[PDB]
Amino acid sequence: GHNNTKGNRKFIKGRYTANAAKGERLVSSEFLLTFAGHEDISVLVRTSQIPEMTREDVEDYGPNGVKFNQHGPIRNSGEIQVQCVETIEGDILQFIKDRIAAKDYVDITMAATPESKSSGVNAVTKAATTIEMLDCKIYSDAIDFSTEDVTAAVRPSLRIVYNWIEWD
Amino acid sequence: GHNNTKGNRKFIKGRYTANAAKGERLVSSEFLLTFAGHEDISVLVRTSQIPEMTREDVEDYGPNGVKFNQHGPIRNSGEIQVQCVETIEGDILQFIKDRIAAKDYVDITMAATPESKSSGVNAVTKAATTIEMLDCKIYSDAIDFSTEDVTAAVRPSLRIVYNWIEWD
Amino acid sequence: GHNNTKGNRKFIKGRYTANAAKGERLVSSEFLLTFAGHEDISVLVRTSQIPEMTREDVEDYGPNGVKFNQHGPIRNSGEIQVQCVETIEGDILQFIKDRIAAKDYVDITMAATPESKSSGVNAVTKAATTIEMLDCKIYSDAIDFSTEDVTAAVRPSLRIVYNWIEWD
Amino acid sequence: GHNNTKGNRKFIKGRYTANAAKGERLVSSEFLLTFAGHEDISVLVRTSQIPEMTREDVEDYGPNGVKFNQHGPIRNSGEIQVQCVETIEGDILQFIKDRIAAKDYVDITMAATPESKSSGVNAVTKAATTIEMLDCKIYSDAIDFSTEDVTAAVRPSLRIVYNWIEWD
Amino acid sequence: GHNNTKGNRKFIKGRYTANAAKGERLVSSEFLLTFAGHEDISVLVRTSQIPEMTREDVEDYGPNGVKFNQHGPIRNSGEIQVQCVETIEGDILQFIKDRIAAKDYVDITMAATPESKSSGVNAVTKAATTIEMLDCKIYSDAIDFSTEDVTAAVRPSLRIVYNWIEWD
Amino acid sequence: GHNNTKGNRKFIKGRYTANAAKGERLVSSEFLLTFAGHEDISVLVRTSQIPEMTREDVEDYGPNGVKFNQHGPIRNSGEIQVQCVETIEGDILQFIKDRIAAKDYVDITMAATPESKSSGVNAVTKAATTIEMLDCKIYSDAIDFSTEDVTAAVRPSLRIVYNWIEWD
């Protein structure tokens, strides 16, 4: 076979130790998205999205066909999609009715609250994994009501528009 | 392994209790869409959609590239798709023929009628999970008539256009 | 678990009785599409489509951003796809050659003829589930002739253009 | 059967020997992408992409319809996608926050470090399989946070823009 | 040997008395399945099955990975298998021929009729162990006709589809 | 034969003493599963299953092909199968009828009650071998009713769904 086939375990051991000694990995199911003044609805959220962290680029064509991409103004505003679960009392439905009728702006705090760092019956967060969105707007979306989905719960879709990303 | 791996059950117990104590989840198969003056047809509906719940946005570009999304005029009109099941007497077919020939507007009431809150042989609704659509128009759609689909029933598709969403 | 979980059977019994007492459901394999003067071909059809039943809409933008959709002129003409099965004598091929050479217009009657209402060896139709298309045009389409499809019959595709929907 | 069906093993043996005597094949899981001044993050990378190695072409239409493609200016800048794995301390999150706030340019070294050529607890690279990107910019991307993905870790997506490819 | 090995008889006697006080156990050979208007065929039945008694469930993913299973709509219909024994006059064969030709719906009564509670030459039933299947359909199945099975009687298999379960 | 064949008895004596000093082994026939408010039915149970005690895992692919399995969110819900024995009065049948009609949630407690630790005519349990399942749901299953099984009692099968496991 191939002549250059020597192998060692110490390199693999070193890589494994370096990968493992850093800490736990953030499971995708450990998160908490809390609105402002509607803390009773934060338990209802089922799927969220940490917003974009990027800035627009500018494109420069230098002499002899060379290319340059340069940092530009920050991209503050944006749109995210959230999946919730409707209840029998229409708590989410009443909330979205109030939001559309009131024409107001709320702020949402998104935090990573794993069970490892949690203490008591309350969630414990960190300044590193906490983001805040101000002047946000919540819109609803069409929800499928099919008789065939007998073993499926209603999943309202919420379009959340954020106008500024803030982190401590 | 990872050094920070401590875990507790009281946090999980608290989250489970908070999630479960709110109430039953609305199953996707529990709904009732009723027209105006055609109550004998509402039993035929098989798939529906609660309409859009949103308003158009306006886009502003502030100084130094900052960006803003602002609430705009409400989005009242819209379109939904409904799936029905044809019968041997063509009740749905006769209904759509009458609708297209009459050139009239009907209003539909959409309600969530779960078995949990139902009383008697009649459905029980709530003001929270009830929507009403006025000045609606019903159009039909092409229906596949294939011989291979021996074990499939005819599924008429109805395009329902709504001009205003009304909630009590 | 959830506190509000009471349930009853009489509501389910009522819904089941209301759904079942209406009548049989139209199976998708029970239909009859008959041309004019070519009754020997109607047995060959394998897949058809009841035409569109809709009218064009007009979009009005009222004051303060409100929106309205209003009934417009009817959509009489339209296009449907039909699947047939070629024979060893080329009856369908001869028919389509005659149609393309003659440059004539034929009228097709679409009927739902379930076995339940049939009497004798002849289908029995109803005025509710019967449509008629006048001034129609039949065009052919490319047919795949692949050697790998040893267990598949030739399926000619017919594009049928209708200029008016007529129902009694 | 076919008349020309003779076969020999010496040709196959020769082809196998020629293919095998060259050396080992680079497994897709053996790589190392190291930033500048952030060596503690290189262990976190999970998926990367060696950048484009191509130049733009110019299209010439000669007489009588003949056609020519000619080498043009080099394509130095470009865009690549990298997949990382979030931790419980948010090291990647803190890094991307620092990058977006600082508005600085970093340089990344891409190397192939197979276990075969590795010595000690350190990776061993070669000048042939080593690339370097200067004046790079790192942007984040939306990350899915779904409850159903209980058995999936968070996978941040990093958009890396490179302005020049450099190889020794 | 083992140290904690003390034993008593009064506990075993109490458990035996509690088990015996519940009454006779229903032998699997004591049953009666009677159709509607075809009481002369119920004797020929040899093997049956009490239908499913369950409802569909809905699966909800709560925060931090917790799961809840909630009651859903009832499962009314179902499919069961019944084994009969063919006679020399083809009574069962004539019955299934009539059923397939007539395209009708029959209702069956399932009863547990043990010899203990029977009186006279007629079975005695109870409301607790009595079920009724409404709007049922009976289909036949392939029957093995082998010469080697000289000491085996023909056992037709009947697929019975039930659309509603009722109990007094 | 073999050269290294020396053997001793003191090692076997030590292993036997260590194995015997652990106490009596729990026989598979010593158990007690009792519901909430239906203590008269717990005697009729014949076969049960202690639920799963595990949590979901997450798979992280480290550099150079190394992989890690990390603890994830706990698995709370689940499904178990329980075999009962029908009586002549249909106590179990009436119980499942009531459970399916009421749409309620019951809590079950599972204990290991060997004769060794039992005192009096009542079972004596321990906190170590006692589990409790909350918000359980009971569904039935098809039961075979065959004439050939003359020497077999009816064995209803119950699907028990548990939504949370608790231990003191």
CSV table of N, CA and C in Angstrom, one decimal, chain B residues 15-139:
chain,number,residue,atom,x,y,z
B,15,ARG,N,-39.5,24.1,35.3
B,15,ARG,CA,-39.9,24.4,33.9
B,15,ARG,C,-41.0,23.5,33.4
B,16,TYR,N,-41.0,22.3,33.8
B,16,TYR,CA,-42.1,21.4,33.4
B,16,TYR,C,-43.5,21.8,34.0
B,17,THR,N,-43.4,22.2,35.3
B,17,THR,CA,-44.7,22.7,36.0
B,17,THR,C,-45.2,23.9,35.3
B,18,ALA,N,-44.3,24.9,35.0
B,18,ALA,CA,-44.7,26.1,34.4
B,18,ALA,C,-45.3,25.8,33.0
B,19,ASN,N,-44.7,24.9,32.2
B,19,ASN,CA,-45.2,24.6,30.9
B,19,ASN,C,-46.5,23.9,31.0
B,20,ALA,N,-46.7,23.0,31.9
B,20,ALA,CA,-47.9,22.2,32.0
B,20,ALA,C,-49.1,22.8,32.7
B,21,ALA,N,-48.9,23.7,33.6
B,21,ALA,CA,-50.0,24.3,34.4
B,21,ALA,C,-50.8,25.3,33.6
B,22,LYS,N,-50.3,25.7,32.4
B,22,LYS,CA,-51.0,26.7,31.7
B,22,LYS,C,-52.3,26.2,31.1
B,23,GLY,N,-52.3,25.0,30.5
B,23,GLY,CA,-53.5,24.5,30.0
B,23,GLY,C,-53.3,23.6,28.8
B,24,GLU,N,-54.4,23.1,28.2
B,24,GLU,CA,-54.3,22.2,27.1
B,24,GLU,C,-53.8,22.9,25.8
B,25,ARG,N,-53.2,22.2,24.9
B,25,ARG,CA,-52.7,22.7,23.7
B,25,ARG,C,-53.8,22.5,22.6
B,26,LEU,N,-54.0,23.5,21.8
B,26,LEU,CA,-55.0,23.4,20.7
B,26,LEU,C,-54.6,22.5,19.6
B,27,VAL,N,-55.3,21.3,19.5
B,27,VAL,CA,-55.0,20.4,18.5
B,27,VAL,C,-55.4,21.0,17.1
B,28,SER,N,-54.6,20.7,16.1
B,28,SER,CA,-54.8,21.2,14.8
B,28,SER,C,-56.1,20.7,14.1
B,29,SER,N,-56.7,19.7,14.6
B,29,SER,CA,-57.9,19.1,14.0
B,29,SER,C,-59.2,19.6,14.6
B,30,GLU,N,-59.1,20.5,15.6
B,30,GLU,CA,-60.3,21.0,16.3
B,30,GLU,C,-60.5,22.5,15.8
B,31,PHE,N,-61.4,22.6,14.9
B,31,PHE,CA,-61.7,24.0,14.3
B,31,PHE,C,-63.1,23.9,13.7
B,32,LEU,N,-63.7,25.1,13.4
B,32,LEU,CA,-65.0,25.2,12.8
B,32,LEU,C,-65.1,26.5,12.0
B,33,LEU,N,-65.2,26.4,10.7
B,33,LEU,CA,-65.4,27.5,9.8
B,33,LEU,C,-66.8,27.5,9.2
B,34,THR,N,-67.6,28.5,9.5
B,34,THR,CA,-69.0,28.6,9.2
B,34,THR,C,-69.3,29.8,8.3
B,35,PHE,N,-69.9,29.6,7.2
B,35,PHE,CA,-70.3,30.6,6.3
B,35,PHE,C,-71.5,31.3,6.8
B,36,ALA,N,-72.1,32.3,6.1
B,36,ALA,CA,-73.3,33.0,6.4
B,36,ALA,C,-74.5,32.5,5.6
B,37,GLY,N,-75.5,31.9,6.2
B,37,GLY,CA,-76.6,31.4,5.5
B,37,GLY,C,-76.4,30.1,4.8
B,38,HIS,N,-75.3,29.4,5.0
B,38,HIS,CA,-74.9,28.1,4.4
B,38,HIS,C,-74.4,27.2,5.5
B,39,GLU,N,-75.0,27.1,6.6
B,39,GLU,CA,-74.6,26.3,7.8
B,39,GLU,C,-74.5,24.8,7.4
B,40,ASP,N,-75.2,24.4,6.4
B,40,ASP,CA,-75.1,22.9,6.0
B,40,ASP,C,-73.8,22.6,5.3
B,41,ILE,N,-73.0,23.6,5.0
B,41,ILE,CA,-71.8,23.3,4.3
B,41,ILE,C,-70.6,23.3,5.2
B,42,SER,N,-70.7,23.9,6.4
B,42,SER,CA,-69.5,24.0,7.3
B,42,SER,C,-69.0,22.7,7.7
B,43,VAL,N,-69.9,21.6,7.7
B,43,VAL,CA,-69.4,20.3,8.1
B,43,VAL,C,-68.5,19.7,7.0
B,44,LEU,N,-68.5,20.2,5.8
B,44,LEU,CA,-67.7,19.7,4.7
B,44,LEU,C,-66.3,20.2,4.7
B,45,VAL,N,-66.0,21.3,5.4
B,45,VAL,CA,-64.6,21.8,5.3
B,45,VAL,C,-63.6,20.8,5.9
B,46,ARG,N,-62.4,20.7,5.3
B,46,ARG,CA,-61.4,19.8,5.8
B,46,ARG,C,-60.1,20.4,6.1
B,47,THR,N,-59.8,21.6,5.6
B,47,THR,CA,-58.5,22.2,5.8
B,47,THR,C,-58.7,23.7,5.6
B,48,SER,N,-58.3,24.5,6.6
B,48,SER,CA,-58.5,26.0,6.5
B,48,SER,C,-57.2,26.7,7.0
B,49,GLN,N,-57.3,28.0,7.1
B,49,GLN,CA,-56.1,28.8,7.5
B,49,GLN,C,-56.6,30.1,8.1
B,50,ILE,N,-56.2,30.3,9.4
B,50,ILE,CA,-56.5,31.6,10.0
B,50,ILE,C,-55.7,32.7,9.2
B,51,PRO,N,-56.3,33.8,8.9
B,51,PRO,CA,-55.6,34.8,7.9
B,51,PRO,C,-54.4,35.5,8.6
B,52,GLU,N,-53.8,36.2,7.7
B,52,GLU,CA,-52.6,37.0,8.1
B,52,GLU,C,-53.0,38.0,9.2
B,53,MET,N,-52.1,38.2,10.2
B,53,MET,CA,-52.3,39.1,11.3
B,53,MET,C,-51.0,40.0,11.3
B,54,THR,N,-51.1,41.1,10.5
B,54,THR,CA,-49.9,41.9,10.4
B,54,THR,C,-50.3,43.2,9.7
B,55,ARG,N,-49.3,44.2,9.7
B,55,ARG,CA,-49.4,45.4,9.0
B,55,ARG,C,-48.2,45.7,8.2
B,56,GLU,N,-48.3,46.4,7.1
B,56,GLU,CA,-47.2,46.7,6.3
B,56,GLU,C,-46.2,47.6,7.0
B,57,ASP,N,-44.9,47.5,6.7
B,57,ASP,CA,-43.9,48.3,7.3
B,57,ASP,C,-43.3,49.3,6.3
B,58,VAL,N,-42.8,50.4,6.9
B,58,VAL,CA,-42.1,51.5,6.1
B,58,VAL,C,-40.6,51.4,6.5
B,59,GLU,N,-39.8,51.7,5.6
B,59,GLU,CA,-38.3,51.5,5.7
B,59,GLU,C,-37.6,52.9,5.6
B,60,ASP,N,-36.9,53.2,6.7
B,60,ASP,CA,-36.2,54.5,6.7
B,60,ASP,C,-34.7,54.3,6.9
B,61,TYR,N,-33.9,55.1,6.2
B,61,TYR,CA,-32.5,55.1,6.2
B,61,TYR,C,-32.0,56.3,6.9
B,62,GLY,N,-31.6,56.2,8.2
B,62,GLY,CA,-31.1,57.3,8.9
B,62,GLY,C,-29.6,57.6,8.6
B,63,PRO,N,-29.1,58.7,9.3
B,63,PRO,CA,-27.8,59.1,9.0
B,63,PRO,C,-26.7,58.0,9.3
B,64,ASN,N,-25.6,58.1,8.6
B,64,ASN,CA,-24.5,57.2,8.8
B,64,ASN,C,-24.9,55.7,8.6
B,65,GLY,N,-25.9,55.4,7.8
B,65,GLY,CA,-26.2,54.1,7.5
B,65,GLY,C,-27.2,53.4,8.5
B,66,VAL,N,-27.6,54.0,9.5
B,66,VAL,CA,-28.5,53.4,10.4
B,66,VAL,C,-29.9,53.2,9.8
B,67,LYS,N,-30.6,52.2,10.2
B,67,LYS,CA,-31.8,51.7,9.5
B,67,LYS,C,-32.9,51.5,10.5
B,68,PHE,N,-34.1,51.8,10.0
B,68,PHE,CA,-35.3,51.7,10.9
B,68,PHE,C,-36.5,51.2,10.1
B,69,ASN,N,-37.2,50.3,10.8
B,69,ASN,CA,-38.5,49.8,10.3
B,69,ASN,C,-39.6,50.3,11.2
B,70,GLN,N,-40.6,50.9,10.6
B,70,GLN,CA,-41.7,51.5,11.3
B,70,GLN,C,-43.0,51.0,10.9
B,71,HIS,N,-44.0,50.9,11.9
B,71,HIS,CA,-45.3,50.4,11.6
B,71,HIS,C,-46.0,51.3,10.6
B,72,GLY,N,-46.7,50.6,9.7
B,72,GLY,CA,-47.5,51.3,8.6
B,72,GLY,C,-48.9,51.0,8.7
B,73,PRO,N,-49.6,51.2,7.5
B,73,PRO,CA,-51.0,50.9,7.5
B,73,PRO,C,-51.3,49.4,7.6
B,74,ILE,N,-52.4,49.1,8.2
B,74,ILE,CA,-52.8,47.7,8.4
B,74,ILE,C,-53.0,47.0,7.1
B,75,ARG,N,-52.8,45.7,7.1
B,75,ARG,CA,-53.0,44.8,5.9
B,75,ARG,C,-54.3,44.1,6.1
B,76,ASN,N,-55.4,44.7,5.6
B,76,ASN,CA,-56.8,44.1,5.9
B,76,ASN,C,-57.1,43.0,4.9
B,77,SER,N,-56.9,43.2,3.6
B,77,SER,CA,-57.2,42.3,2.5
B,77,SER,C,-56.2,41.1,2.5
B,78,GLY,N,-56.6,40.0,1.9
B,78,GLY,CA,-55.7,38.9,1.8
B,78,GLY,C,-56.4,37.7,1.2
B,79,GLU,N,-55.7,36.6,1.1
B,79,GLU,CA,-56.1,35.4,0.4
B,79,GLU,C,-55.8,34.2,1.3
B,80,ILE,N,-56.7,33.2,1.3
B,80,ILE,CA,-56.4,31.9,2.0
B,80,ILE,C,-56.9,30.8,1.2
B,81,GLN,N,-56.4,29.6,1.5
B,81,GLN,CA,-56.7,28.4,0.7
B,81,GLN,C,-57.4,27.4,1.7
B,82,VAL,N,-58.5,26.8,1.2
B,82,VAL,CA,-59.3,25.9,2.0
B,82,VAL,C,-59.5,24.6,1.2
B,83,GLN,N,-59.4,23.5,1.8
B,83,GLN,CA,-59.6,22.2,1.2
B,83,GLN,C,-60.9,21.6,1.7
B,84,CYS,N,-61.7,21.1,0.7
B,84,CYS,CA,-63.0,20.5,1.0
B,84,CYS,C,-63.0,19.1,0.4
B,85,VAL,N,-64.2,18.4,0.6
B,85,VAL,CA,-64.3,17.0,0.1
B,85,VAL,C,-65.6,17.0,-0.7
B,86,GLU,N,-65.6,16.6,-2.0
B,86,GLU,CA,-66.8,16.5,-2.8
B,86,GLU,C,-67.6,15.3,-2.4
B,87,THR,N,-68.9,15.5,-2.6
B,87,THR,CA,-69.9,14.4,-2.3
B,87,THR,C,-70.4,13.8,-3.5
B,88,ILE,N,-71.4,12.9,-3.4
B,88,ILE,CA,-72.0,12.3,-4.5
B,88,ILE,C,-73.1,13.1,-5.1
B,89,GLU,N,-73.7,14.1,-4.4
B,89,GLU,CA,-74.7,15.0,-4.8
B,89,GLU,C,-74.2,16.3,-5.3
B,90,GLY,N,-72.9,16.5,-5.2
B,90,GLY,CA,-72.3,17.8,-5.6
B,90,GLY,C,-72.8,19.0,-4.8
B,91,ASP,N,-72.9,18.8,-3.5
B,91,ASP,CA,-73.3,20.0,-2.7
B,91,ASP,C,-72.3,21.1,-2.7
B,92,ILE,N,-71.0,20.8,-2.6
B,92,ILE,CA,-69.9,21.8,-2.8
B,92,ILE,C,-69.9,22.4,-4.2
B,93,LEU,N,-70.1,21.5,-5.2
B,93,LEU,CA,-70.1,22.0,-6.6
B,93,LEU,C,-71.3,22.9,-6.8
B,94,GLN,N,-72.5,22.6,-6.3
B,94,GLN,CA,-73.7,23.4,-6.4
B,94,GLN,C,-73.4,24.8,-5.7
B,95,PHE,N,-72.8,24.7,-4.5
B,95,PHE,CA,-72.5,25.9,-3.7
B,95,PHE,C,-71.6,26.8,-4.5
B,96,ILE,N,-70.5,26.3,-5.1
B,96,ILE,CA,-69.6,27.2,-5.8
B,96,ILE,C,-70.2,27.7,-7.1
B,97,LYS,N,-71.1,26.9,-7.8
B,97,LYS,CA,-71.8,27.4,-8.9
B,97,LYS,C,-72.7,28.6,-8.5
B,98,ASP,N,-73.4,28.4,-7.4
B,98,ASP,CA,-74.3,29.5,-6.9
B,98,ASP,C,-73.5,30.8,-6.6
B,99,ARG,N,-72.3,30.6,-5.9
B,99,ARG,CA,-71.5,31.7,-5.6
B,99,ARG,C,-71.0,32.4,-6.8
B,100,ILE,N,-70.5,31.7,-7.8
B,100,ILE,CA,-70.0,32.4,-9.0
B,100,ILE,C,-71.1,33.0,-9.8
B,101,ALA,N,-72.3,32.4,-9.8
B,101,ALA,CA,-73.3,33.0,-10.6
B,101,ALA,C,-73.9,34.2,-9.9
B,102,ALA,N,-74.0,34.2,-8.6
B,102,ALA,CA,-74.7,35.3,-7.8
B,102,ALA,C,-73.9,36.6,-7.7
B,103,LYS,N,-72.5,36.5,-7.8
B,103,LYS,CA,-71.6,37.6,-7.6
B,103,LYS,C,-71.9,38.4,-6.3
B,104,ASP,N,-72.0,37.6,-5.2
B,104,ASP,CA,-72.3,38.2,-3.9
B,104,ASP,C,-71.2,38.0,-3.0
B,105,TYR,N,-71.3,38.7,-1.8
B,105,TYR,CA,-70.3,38.6,-0.8
B,105,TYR,C,-70.8,38.0,0.5
B,106,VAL,N,-70.1,37.0,1.0
B,106,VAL,CA,-70.5,36.4,2.3
B,106,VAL,C,-69.4,36.6,3.3
B,107,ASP,N,-69.8,36.4,4.6
B,107,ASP,CA,-68.9,36.5,5.7
B,107,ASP,C,-68.8,35.2,6.4
B,108,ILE,N,-67.5,34.9,6.8
B,108,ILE,CA,-67.2,33.6,7.4
B,108,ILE,C,-66.7,33.8,8.8
B,109,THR,N,-67.2,33.0,9.8
B,109,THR,CA,-66.8,33.0,11.1
B,109,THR,C,-65.8,31.8,11.4
B,110,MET,N,-64.6,32.0,11.8
B,110,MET,CA,-63.6,31.0,12.1
B,110,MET,C,-63.5,30.9,13.6
B,111,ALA,N,-63.7,29.7,14.1
B,111,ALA,CA,-63.7,29.5,15.6
B,111,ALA,C,-62.9,28.2,15.9
B,112,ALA,N,-62.3,28.2,17.1
B,112,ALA,CA,-61.7,27.0,17.6
B,112,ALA,C,-62.6,26.4,18.7
B,113,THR,N,-63.1,25.1,18.4
B,113,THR,CA,-64.1,24.4,19.2
B,113,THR,C,-63.5,23.1,19.6
B,114,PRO,N,-62.6,23.1,20.6
B,114,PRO,CA,-62.1,21.8,21.1
B,114,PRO,C,-63.1,21.0,21.9
B,115,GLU,N,-62.9,19.7,21.9
B,115,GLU,CA,-63.8,18.8,22.6
B,115,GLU,C,-63.8,19.1,24.1
B,116,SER,N,-62.7,19.7,24.6
B,116,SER,CA,-62.6,20.0,26.1
B,116,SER,C,-63.6,20.9,26.5
B,117,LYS,N,-63.8,22.0,25.8
B,117,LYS,CA,-64.8,23.1,26.2
B,117,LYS,C,-66.2,22.9,25.6
B,118,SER,N,-66.4,21.9,24.7
B,118,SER,CA,-67.6,21.6,24.1
B,118,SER,C,-68.7,21.2,25.1
B,119,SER,N,-69.9,21.6,24.9
B,119,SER,CA,-71.0,21.2,25.7
B,119,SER,C,-72.2,20.7,24.9
B,120,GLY,N,-72.8,19.6,25.2
B,120,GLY,CA,-73.9,19.1,24.4
B,120,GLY,C,-73.4,18.6,23.0
B,121,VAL,N,-74.3,18.6,22.1
B,121,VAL,CA,-74.0,18.2,20.7
B,121,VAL,C,-73.7,19.4,19.9
B,122,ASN,N,-73.5,20.6,20.5
B,122,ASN,CA,-73.2,21.8,19.8
B,122,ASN,C,-71.8,22.3,20.3
B,123,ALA,N,-71.1,23.0,19.3
B,123,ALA,CA,-69.8,23.5,19.6
B,123,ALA,C,-69.8,24.7,20.5
B,124,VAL,N,-68.8,24.8,21.4
B,124,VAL,CA,-68.7,26.0,22.3
B,124,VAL,C,-67.4,26.7,21.9
B,125,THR,N,-67.6,28.0,21.6
B,125,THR,CA,-66.5,28.9,21.2
B,125,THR,C,-66.1,29.9,22.3
B,126,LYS,N,-65.1,30.7,22.0
B,126,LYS,CA,-64.6,31.7,22.9
B,126,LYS,C,-64.3,33.0,22.1
B,127,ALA,N,-64.4,34.1,22.8
B,127,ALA,CA,-64.1,35.4,22.1
B,127,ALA,C,-62.6,35.5,21.7
B,128,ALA,N,-61.7,34.8,22.5
B,128,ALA,CA,-60.3,34.9,22.2
B,128,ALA,C,-59.9,34.2,20.9
B,129,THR,N,-60.4,33.0,20.6
B,129,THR,CA,-60.1,32.2,19.5
B,129,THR,C,-61.1,32.3,18.4
B,130,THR,N,-61.8,33.4,18.2
B,130,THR,CA,-62.8,33.6,17.2
B,130,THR,C,-62.5,34.8,16.3
B,131,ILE,N,-62.5,34.6,15.0
B,131,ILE,CA,-62.2,35.6,14.0
B,131,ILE,C,-63.4,35.7,13.0
B,132,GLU,N,-63.6,36.8,12.4
B,132,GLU,CA,-64.7,37.0,11.4
B,132,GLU,C,-64.1,37.7,10.2
B,133,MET,N,-64.5,37.2,9.0
B,133,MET,CA,-64.1,37.8,7.8
B,133,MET,C,-65.3,38.3,7.0
B,134,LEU,N,-65.3,39.6,6.6
B,134,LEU,CA,-66.4,40.2,5.9
B,134,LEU,C,-66.1,40.4,4.4
B,135,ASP,N,-67.1,40.5,3.6
B,135,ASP,CA,-67.0,40.9,2.2
B,135,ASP,C,-66.1,39.9,1.5
B,136,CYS,N,-66.2,38.6,1.9
B,136,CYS,CA,-65.3,37.6,1.3
B,136,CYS,C,-65.8,37.1,0.0
B,137,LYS,N,-64.9,36.6,-0.8
B,137,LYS,CA,-65.2,36.0,-2.1
B,137,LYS,C,-64.6,34.6,-2.2
B,138,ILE,N,-65.4,33.7,-2.8
B,138,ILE,CA,-65.0,32.3,-2.9
B,138,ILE,C,-64.9,31.9,-4.3
B,139,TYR,N,-63.7,31.4,-4.7
B,139,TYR,CA,-63.4,30.9,-6.0
B,139,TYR,C,-63.0,29.5,-6.0
